[PDB]
Write an enzyme that holds these catalytic residues in place. Sequence first.
Site, PDB file in Angstrom:
ATOM      1  N   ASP B  41      40.696  17.691 -19.778  1.00 50.16           N
ATOM      2  CA  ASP B  41      39.692  18.735 -19.598  1.00 50.16           C
ATOM      3  C   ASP B  41      40.296  20.001 -18.994  1.00 50.16           C
ATOM      4  O   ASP B  41      41.496  20.069 -18.750  1.00 50.16           O
ATOM      5  CB  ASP B  41      38.550  18.231 -18.719  1.00 50.16           C
ATOM      6  CG  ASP B  41      39.002  17.873 -17.322  1.00 50.16           C
ATOM      7  OD1 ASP B  41      38.185  17.325 -16.554  1.00 50.16           O
ATOM      8  OD2 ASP B  41      40.173  18.128 -16.988  1.00 50.16           O
ATOM      9  N   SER B  42      39.458  20.997 -18.755  1.00 54.28           N
ATOM     10  CA  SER B  42      39.915  22.277 -18.249  1.00 54.28           C
ATOM     11  C   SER B  42      40.715  22.120 -16.962  1.00 54.28           C
ATOM     12  O   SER B  42      41.734  22.825 -16.776  1.00 54.28           O
ATOM     13  CB  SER B  42      38.732  23.202 -17.987  1.00 54.28           C
ATOM     14  OG  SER B  42      37.649  22.815 -18.776  1.00 54.28           O
TER      15      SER B  42
END
Lengths: 601, 86, 52, 98, 459, 172, 171
Positions: B41-42
């Site tokens: 994820d980010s």
Amino acid sequence: MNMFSSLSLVTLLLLTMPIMMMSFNTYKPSNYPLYVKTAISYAFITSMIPTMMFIHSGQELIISNWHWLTIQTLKLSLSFKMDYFSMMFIPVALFVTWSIMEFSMWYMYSDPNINKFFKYLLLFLITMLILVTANNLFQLFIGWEGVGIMSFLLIGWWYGRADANTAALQAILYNRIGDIGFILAMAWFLTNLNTWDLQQIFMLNPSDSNMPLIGLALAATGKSAQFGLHPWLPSAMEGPTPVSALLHSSTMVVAGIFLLIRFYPLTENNKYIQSITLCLGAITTLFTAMCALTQNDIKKIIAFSTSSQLGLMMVTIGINQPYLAFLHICTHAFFKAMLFMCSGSIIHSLNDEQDIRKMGGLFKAMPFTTTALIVGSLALTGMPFLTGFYSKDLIIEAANTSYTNAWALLMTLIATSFTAIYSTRIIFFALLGQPRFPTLVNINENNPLLINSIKRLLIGSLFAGYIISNNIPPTTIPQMTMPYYLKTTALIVTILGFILALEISNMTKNLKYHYPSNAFKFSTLLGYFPTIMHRLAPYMNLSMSSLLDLIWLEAILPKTISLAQMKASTLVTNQKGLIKLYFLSFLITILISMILFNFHE
Amino acid sequence: APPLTLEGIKDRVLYVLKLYDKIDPEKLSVNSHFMKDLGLDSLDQVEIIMAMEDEFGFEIPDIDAEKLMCPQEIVDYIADKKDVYE
Amino acid sequence: VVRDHWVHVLVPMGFVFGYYLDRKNDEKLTAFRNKSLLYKRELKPNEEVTWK
Amino acid sequence: RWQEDPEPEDENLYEKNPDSHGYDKDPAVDIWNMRVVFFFGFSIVLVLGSTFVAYLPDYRMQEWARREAERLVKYREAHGLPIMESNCFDPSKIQLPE
Amino acid sequence: MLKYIIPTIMLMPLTWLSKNNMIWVNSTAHSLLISFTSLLLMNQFGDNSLNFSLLFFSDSLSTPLLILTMWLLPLMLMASQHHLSKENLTRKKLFITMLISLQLFLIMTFTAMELILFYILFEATLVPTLIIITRWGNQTERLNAGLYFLFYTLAGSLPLLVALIYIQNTVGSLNFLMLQYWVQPVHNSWSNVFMWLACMMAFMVKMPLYGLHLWLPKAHVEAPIAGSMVLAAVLLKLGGYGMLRITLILNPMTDFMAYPFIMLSLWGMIMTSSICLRQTDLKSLIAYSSVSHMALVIVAILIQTPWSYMGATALMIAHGLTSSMLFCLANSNYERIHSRTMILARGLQTLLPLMATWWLLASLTNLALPPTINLIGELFVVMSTFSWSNITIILMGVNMVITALYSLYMLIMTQRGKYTYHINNISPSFTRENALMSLHILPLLLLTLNPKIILGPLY
Amino acid sequence: AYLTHQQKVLRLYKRALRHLESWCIHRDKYRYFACLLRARFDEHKNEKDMVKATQLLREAEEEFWHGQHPQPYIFPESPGGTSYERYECYKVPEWCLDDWHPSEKAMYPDYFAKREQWKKLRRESWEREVKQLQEETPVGGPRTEALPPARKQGDLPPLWWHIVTRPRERPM
Amino acid sequence: DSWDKDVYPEPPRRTPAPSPQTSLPNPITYLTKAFDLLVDRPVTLVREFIERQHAKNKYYYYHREFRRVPDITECQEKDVLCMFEAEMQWRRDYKVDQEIVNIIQERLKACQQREGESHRQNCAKELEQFTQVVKAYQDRYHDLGAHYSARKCLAKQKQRMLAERKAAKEA
Ligand SMILES: CCCCCCCCCCCCO[C@@H]1O[C@H](CO)[C@@H](O[C@H]2O[C@H](CO)[C@@H](O)[C@H](O)[C@H]2O)[C@H](O)[C@H]1O
Ligand SMILES: CCCCCCCCCCCCO[C@@H]1O[C@H](CO)[C@@H](O[C@H]2O[C@H](CO)[C@@H](O)[C@H](O)[C@H]2O)[C@H](O)[C@H]1O
Ligand SMILES: CCCCCCCCCCCCO[C@@H]1O[C@H](CO)[C@@H](O[C@H]2O[C@H](CO)[C@@H](O)[C@H](O)[C@H]2O)[C@H](O)[C@H]1O
Ligand SMILES: CCCCCCCCCCCCO[C@@H]1O[C@H](CO)[C@@H](O[C@H]2O[C@H](CO)[C@@H](O)[C@H](O)[C@H]2O)[C@H](O)[C@H]1O
């Protein structure tokens, strides 16, 4: 005198021929840095012959070889004072400068302007010798400003960097504020004694020396970076490490102390000046050592150490110990220049990394750098019988067995303890622990130029204090009778500093997370003095450029003058062209001519 | 400092990724999207950039960092800044 | 003499002409030649003017 | 709006003369103008002018005054007279008011 | 003086009769020879000045100004011949004629023994200077700059003419040698106050005195390089020379009439230096630098001490060579980027390494680095002004701090930092440009070896 | 700010970790706290109320400002680092080679032959590059600073010279 | 010697004989011997050759003696011809008296260096003679101004003389 006088001049003349060949361009740039390094090494040897003569028979002479200019009753000559202070400083300066240039042949090897760099290093040394040997204040002023300009050109070596241009100009700004006192001294001496020559100043021995001595004290504050004019010296870490090494040891920063030592016949009879200089030095040594406790940039830590040491020299001036202050200049020159070269060895090996937080584990990876860095730190802290012990230990005993300000004494002892704390800080974070640098390991310290240059300064850091302390003639009564608790003060507080610093350093390995105290930020941000002053003072000055002035302006404006002439012109020329009106005015001119001015009477 | 090469940069970029526990060192390839393929994820992408920053000793601005989504893009970015042309 | 390089004598000649005019003007100012209290003296065997 | 020449593009002397000294567009004039400047400016005025100034004869009798001052100091010390007496003019020649 | 006046006039036929392509070669070559012969003026004596004739004399104050004046003519031709290269041939000869006529008036101004002769030649310099600015200036504002220059000068000169003619009426002579022996003290009265102001306010304007200085930045910004060189180097010195001669006959009234003008100069020098820190135009910065430097000369002349006149003499020569050099340095940039904005062209040391050495040397002399004659002159004024009143050391000291700040700031702004990306026409320095700077800086530095010849008659 | 909420959180995360790393120094210590900090971000990662998420961010920024290192570590070549701009004085623009004297250009006959080819390529491509921008820029002018890629074969990307030919980071 | 020792006196030089108390050889002794052979001998030979060229060409220069002329006190008011000679004479005396103060200052400065740590007691005559000479110079020339002259010098003296007359008349 023939051998003494002749050889003390060839030393100075020898340093200039490399300059003449570059300017005259009859040299060979194939290996100019080696040529400049060779010139220092020979100049060091030729300067030892005069020094041995002084050590032997106390010989001292003044050389006034060229009559430059006469100003009515003020005659100025090129005049060189080869005395105790000149004969002992020159070999120490040349020996340390010999090491820095050899180190520079390695550190600045990839610099395309290496030849100019060594030309500037040499000119920087030449002006320091003009300053050191000057016999009158005008020739001394040449050296005073010479080192100032050479600092500017070397701090701002990387002139594409905006911060290097800011730092170079900041050295000029602070040092030029100090020169206000220097000009004040020359003005007072010319007016009241009719001389700039030191022999006449000391012979007339003015009783009322508060004004000229404050002028010299203010001059020393800027040059030696005492509190109030101090920030520039840490900022001078913009320049390459060889500049920092030479700047902080045997050139610019001790000129301020050296100037006050030159004038000890005056200050030794002026208790007011002694109190001022003692307190100025005492605050400087505490404040800048407190700042060093929490600096993470290796050059800045060593830079703040120099300010702390310069304060201690100023304290020594204050307690009326000019010769101890001089001995500390000579001894400090060895190990301080070595610490800056040891730091340069680390910075070079860690790919221009200067922050200590990204070092560590270098104790075994860089054995020779590690040895010199421990010797340097032990010499700085006043380990018994290393170069720094033979001056610092004496100074502390003199201070606490003297009639002195109690606060000044206490602040000098606390600062001495701080010296152990920030020396442990460099050793603990740079060398001990686990490595914290990037993965691609390029640690290499096997260049003979690096090893030899540090090796020679390492030997000085061990024996130089012993050698000098046993050869200089005695010029005071050294106080050697005192209680055990005054004799051992410097050793004890230094030991407590090591213990206390070790515990805090080990305290950082724990899994605790803490908020910065106001004290921590105050030390880290240098007391906010640069943050406040360097925004407020420039802003007030750069933005620096009633009804009474309204009259003095609106009335005298060229617009006012030029616009009244326009009204008068229009009144004169805006006529109707009518015969009737012009002749009606002829009638009025005649009537008032007779009735009012009696032109017919 | 010793010079870099395109294959040297790629070798070290993957080396760092192979020492990250959220990535499968077998599924890893120069063209793996950290989001679509590797499942990260980010927040993990930010830490990857910080790891590459610590590896090569220089900062990647956030404006540039967020766009580096596969190992090849990181390799290309480093070579451009270091003037590596191999 | 060349028509190329005859203008290069205008200023050197001006100096000689000016120098000569300067010397002549000194002849109009000989009222005190060998008469000042500081410098007057008897004349040498062949001297006729202490300066000129 | 009205008839006017456009501003001509700025010219570079090195374009058609890489050896240009910057004095003229004509290479023969450019070298000549350089030689008169360097010769007369440096060889003559600065070198000879500096030598001329170095050897000016006792400019403003600074050497004579020292020699004379030595002569008077020798005389007055041998004869016991003061080296320098405060009254610049002989007071016998003065007549104070009142 | 005819050994210099006549050769100077001969520069006119030489220029007019020179082959078309040789006007710059011939005028420069022969103006340098005249400068060479000007060294014969240095036959100075300890007691008497060099009195050639009833019209002209030379002493230790006029000789260095005379040598500076004649040295400057060949330098202005070198500086001028580039931007005039496209000029019509006849208009080139007229431009050179104006410079020659300016030297002619100037060498006679500095040697005139009669003050009314001095006034006529002093006031005659206006015509060639005004013509140069308004005819060969490049901008619209050159016309206003001409008028300000013209009417500032005449505003003071016309009162001066009345005062001089009054003085000849009551004293019988205006010969300077005569006025030395026949001078009588000036007593307090409103009549003598205005005689004092008339005798001095013409010179204060040319210095310029702070308050009356606003014509100078206008003229400089609009004048061609040669107009800026003569204006800064020599024309400003006319006021100083006039004040050094006229103050002889204004004592003892100068004791209290000096006070307002010392206050303007002591405060003015601090403010003009500070203004230099915020100037955006390079030529305007150097102009405001002259006002700051010339304020020292006014203070020195007004306090009237042996040390202050030696200092003022050195300052005028030193500032003359330095200010001329700085203008030529800024012109070399302008001939490339065609702008005077200081911030436009940056990081030039990278592209013009040798021209960056000239910039450094010029800046160091401007801030008066020991032992340059810029410092020697500045120091002597400080020493004497300290005796006048100790408190002045504070203002003198502050000015040195500010003077360093803007001198190096101008060096750092234009020579250091990063170069301007879009400026790609910075061609290498021409031999003409390098020789021009070396002819300023080498003589300036050589005079340190023998500074007595620029210390004036009180040495 | 031009940044989306998602971008703002990430910049804070990277900034927060770096200042945390300055405090800890020792890598083992830094690892322990870095994981605790990542936990705090992971706790509210799925917050869906953009008024609460915005509040959480603003409070986080205030906490960072109170806890930031007064002297954080800076990479030597980053803005503010000790080597920032250190080499700008060695970067000479390529147009300076046009002013070289023939004798200077004769020492590199092969470099200056290649240089001419690039100059030719720049001259030949310019007109197409200008045209491509004109027929892709919306009426009124561009709205962003993003430039287009080349579309056809034998076309170079518009405005490429000063990017391709820029000085090296270690020019000397 | 080559200057007049009377104008620039120097006390006789007393240098103690070497009395070494160490078996070691003095480094300075050997360096002196090397300096004498390497430096002094070739330098002397070059000088002797030069002094031989000078001997073959011996010409003379003289010290200018100025005759005395009437002072400014004997000049009729506004008589420029007599005033000018008294003014030139006064300026030469002024420049000479500046050099006398420099000679005495030089004696003082040389004494302070020569005596060393004992200079305070051993340089009392040089200090006294400097104090007396500076007093006389100040009375003559101090405060005249940049445009000084024999006239202003005389006016300063007369004011001083009147003050001293009132000093004697008062007691
Ligand atoms: C101390 C004594 C000094 C004596 C100096 C000699 C005096 C010479 C007087 C010339 C005055 C005439 O000059 C004239 O002045 C007016 C001033 O408003 C200028 O007027 C200018 O500004 C005004 C408004 O401020 C505008 O309305 C006008 O359009 C504009 O031209 C004229 O452009 C100019 O032609
Ligand atoms: C004591 C005072 C001494 C003053 C000395 C002044 C020196 C000035 C040097 C200028 C030298 C110019 O001398 C020059 O000579 C040649 C031939 O003779 C002339 O003729 C030349 O014209 C052109 C140049 O334009 C040449 O290409 C051509 O080959 C040649 O015929 C030039 O027109 C003249 O300009
Ligand atoms: C302080 C001591 C000496 C002071 C001497 C003062 C006398 C006047 C000298 C200048 C005379 C100039 O005369 C005239 O003035 C005005 C402004 O001043 C100029 O005009 C300029 O300023 C005015 C208003 O400021 C503007 O409206 C106009 O657009 C502008 O061009 C004219 O172009 C000029 O011709
Ligand atoms: C740039 C601006 C410069 C401003 C400088 C200002 C300086 C001010 C100087 C004031 C001195 C004027 O001169 C002073 O006035 C008058 C002359 O009319 C003299 O006195 C004379 O006139 C007054 C009239 O009030 C009578 O009282 C008195 O009986 C008479 O002798 C004073 O004895 C003199 O000292």
